[PDB]
Amino acid sequence: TQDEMKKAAGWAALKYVEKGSIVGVGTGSTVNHFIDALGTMSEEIKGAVSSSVASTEKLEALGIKIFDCNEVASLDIYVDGADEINADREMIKGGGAALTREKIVAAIADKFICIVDGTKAVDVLGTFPLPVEVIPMARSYVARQLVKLGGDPCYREGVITDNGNVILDVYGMKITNPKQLEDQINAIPGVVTVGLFAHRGADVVITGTPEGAKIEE
Amino acid sequence: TQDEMKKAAGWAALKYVEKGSIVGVGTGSTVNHFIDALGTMSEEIKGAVSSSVASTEKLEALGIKIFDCNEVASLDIYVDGADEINADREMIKGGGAALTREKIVAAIADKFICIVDGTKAVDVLGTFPLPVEVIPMARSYVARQLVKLGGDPCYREGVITDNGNVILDVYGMKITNPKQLEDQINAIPGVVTVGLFAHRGADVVITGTPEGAKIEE
Numbered sequence: 109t110q111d112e113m114k115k116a117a118g119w120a121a122l123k124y125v126e127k128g129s130i131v132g133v134g135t136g137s138t139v140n141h142f143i144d145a146l147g148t149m150s151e152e153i154k155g156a157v158s159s160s161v162a163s164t165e166k167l168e169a170l171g172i173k174i175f176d177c178n179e180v181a182s183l184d185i186y187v188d189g190a191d192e193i194n195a196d197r198e199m200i201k202g203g204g205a206a207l208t209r210e211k212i213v214a215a216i217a218d219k220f221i222c223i224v225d226g227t228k229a230v231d232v233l234g235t236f237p238l239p240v241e242v243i244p245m246a247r248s249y250v251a252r253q254l255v256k257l258g259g260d261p262c263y264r265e266g267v268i269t270d271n272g273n274v275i276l277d278v279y280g281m282k283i284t285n286p287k288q289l290e291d292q293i294n295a296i297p298g299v300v301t302v303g304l305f306a307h308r309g310a311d312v313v314i315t316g317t318p319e320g321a322k323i324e325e
Numbered sequence: 326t327q328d329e330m331k332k333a334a335g336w337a338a339l340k341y342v343e344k345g346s347i348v349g350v351g352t353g354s355t356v357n358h359f360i361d362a363l364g365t366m367s368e369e370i371k372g373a374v375s376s377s378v379a380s381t382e383k384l385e386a387l388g389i390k391i392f393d394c395n396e397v398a399s400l401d402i403y404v405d406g407a408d409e410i411n412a413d414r415e416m417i418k419g420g421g422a423a424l425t426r427e428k429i430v431a432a433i434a435d436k437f438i439c440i441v442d443g444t445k446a447v448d449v450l451g452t453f454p455l456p457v458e459v460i461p462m463a464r465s466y467v468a469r470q471l472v473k474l475g476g477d478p479c480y481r482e483g484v485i486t487d488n489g490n491v492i493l494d495v496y497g498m499k500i501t502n503p504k505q506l507e508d509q510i511n512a513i514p515g516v517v518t519v520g521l522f523a524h525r526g527a528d529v530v531i532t533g534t535p536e537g538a539k540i541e542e
Contacts, residue, residue, distance in 0.1 A: 212463045215514040246429040297432035
């Protein structure tokens, strides 16, 4: 409410950061507090991979070396937030940052450290619209397919991804079987990426509470 | 490969063209014969949706109207060649054409008519390298995962797709379960499109033989 719990949470992640390593870094206000923590040890870290322009400019300014995903075989950790997280640590992500870059850095990372306030934990994924990046010539097609799956896809007009793709935000779904829905949407021709992190979810969850953050991994 | 067999196959596809329809049209030498055929019936069709720059030029030469995929809700047919086709009518496609375009136009069309000479049928897919379009920052990652699936991914250097993505051509696979492999690749973060046409394959195969066109419905 309370990006004091956002900050508790973000600094709480610093314990996962090893001397000599390259750190995977997401974005958000709660990650940006983790980047404030991380600069506290700029000297002891080899560098960072980031899924966000804002974070990388911030890491650079702290003098932390930036690596390209194609320069690493893996990352020890990826520290990011989520839009929703369920009891099984499956997430909706990409509602407010670079969906495809987040999914790719999280894929290369050994451990995903999810960093949230009290509002992210849910029963059933899906209240928060599910972002789906779509090749532009396919947008009406993919949208027909999401309707068949019982979603209500809404095109995010006036913007594109760095790649030039469009975003559909899918409302109204009760996402029981996230792994299955991830499968289903990844199968639709014209889909680039789907904001269900269900086959690879959070490994540690750190939730900001009033008394200083809850490491409920 | 014989051009007269390509020619026979492309002309035979013309029987499948309903008057007053918008025709899905692919690319290649075999399809160029089909386009010739379609010329003979042009003032009898509303238009065409094409997956190829060169096919659009040819259809425009004939005065056939061009529609985009977002302008139609379905297509009756899509007429295209293939790199390889198994006896189950599953194809490798995209080796020398616009892979993502073709898979989306085929997803929209009701009926896929695959027009081939005798050199496209194979017992098992995989000799012909499988094209995978990939987000550039994900290239090494996706190649690591393709190697885990048994393949030899080769980066198609010097070039990008319309969308700015890279292509990995994957050698050395014995694609005994095309629907599974499509599912597996479709789920690697960073994959945009896989040249496996397995869940949605060909509905009609017209093969050009030394005798004439042979139709397999």
